[PDB]
Amino acid sequence: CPLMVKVLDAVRGSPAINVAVHVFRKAADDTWEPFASGKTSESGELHGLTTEEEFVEGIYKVEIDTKSYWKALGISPFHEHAEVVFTANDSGPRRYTIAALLSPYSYSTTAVVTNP
């Protein structure tokens, strides 16, 4: 699994469940091409977005749809989404975890990058 997303909820002290995630790749024409999408599980994790073969070098944008998440819980949050934009695999294949911690007016994100 070369690209995984994990999301926690700082209001409830829980995984952030059923958070939509859309991944885009920058195309040769400098537009954002849809690449993969999914939703976090009961554990707040989203696995299976892509494969090592498909996850080539490029600039990727991971959009975490935080507004849609908070609105269901009856919170009107600040952000439209949390965006994570990064160059991937430019020194060979790596495994990436994007971790995010959500509050209605704040989010914190990091990356864990490992060499398989």
Add this chain to the structure above:
Amino acid sequence: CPLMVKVLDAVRGSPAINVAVHVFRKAADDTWEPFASGKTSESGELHGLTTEEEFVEGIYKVEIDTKSYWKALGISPFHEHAEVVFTANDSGPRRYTIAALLSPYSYSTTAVVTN
């Protein structure tokens, strides 16, 4: 100042100085139109981006060029930039402060919306 940006460096425990910031507004055709830009000051702040008259309700994107900041310190960072995307509301007089805390593989952003 209806819109202020503040950037901190979590490695050095300092303001993040001379960081480029670009602000865009979402146009009717779902593209991002340039709206305002600047560089953070010695205090890590960027004031005077816009005015109450120009800053109408809409979706805005604040792009903070964190990659250039880290590279200038000899650090290969993770992100291309930090992006903060939000709808401005009237409603909630008035002032938006977008704060960002930067690490090489991390950032956190918070909005302080006050009167």
Add this chain to the structure above:
Amino acid sequence: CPLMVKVLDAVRGSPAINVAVHVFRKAADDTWEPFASGKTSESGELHGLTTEEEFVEGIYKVEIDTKSYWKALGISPFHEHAEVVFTANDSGPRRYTIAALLSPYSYSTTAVVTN
């Protein structure tokens, strides 16, 4: 102000007002002696805790009573308080800003150490 505390609320996107803050210094016998205290202002800030003369090198603990803050908003929070424990250095003129960002089950704290 060699020592300032700033507290933000990540649920409301606001300063955290009327938050009690206690500062302690580590005594020679490894106990924490009261040093300074106050409540955050309407801007979420607490100034005037100490003076350059009194704030010597040493280990300090800043205790932020986050539990009372959340309970007053009807929220059962996780932490008893937020604690920030650090050595003050001379060296690095001079000013310490301890910032804290509060959520019910989370907090983040950052130090801005400037001249």
Add this chain to the structure above:
Amino acid sequence: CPLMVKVLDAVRGSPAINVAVHVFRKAADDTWEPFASGKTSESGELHGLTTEEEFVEGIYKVEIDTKSYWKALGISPFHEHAEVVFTANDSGPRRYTIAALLSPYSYSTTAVVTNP
């Protein structure tokens, strides 16, 4: 496993490996009694601190020894340690994960609390 600690490094984009963790419980006399300790693994995780039987209701302090961690990497950090103080199990037994994200002048911590 009713008490687990997970720690990430925001400078290196990795788990925070070999971070010492000391847990204390507030005693009847309002002093902090040593309760459990250990170090994070290669995955940044610390399991096996306590048992459900031993982890009774109380106020617990989890001290994450961040200074000792950064100094080895030749960084002189700001904090002595990151402290997490919380009441546990006061509505029955729960499982607690304390997650922390470390930078030299900043740390971010949350709790994931689940009901077994």
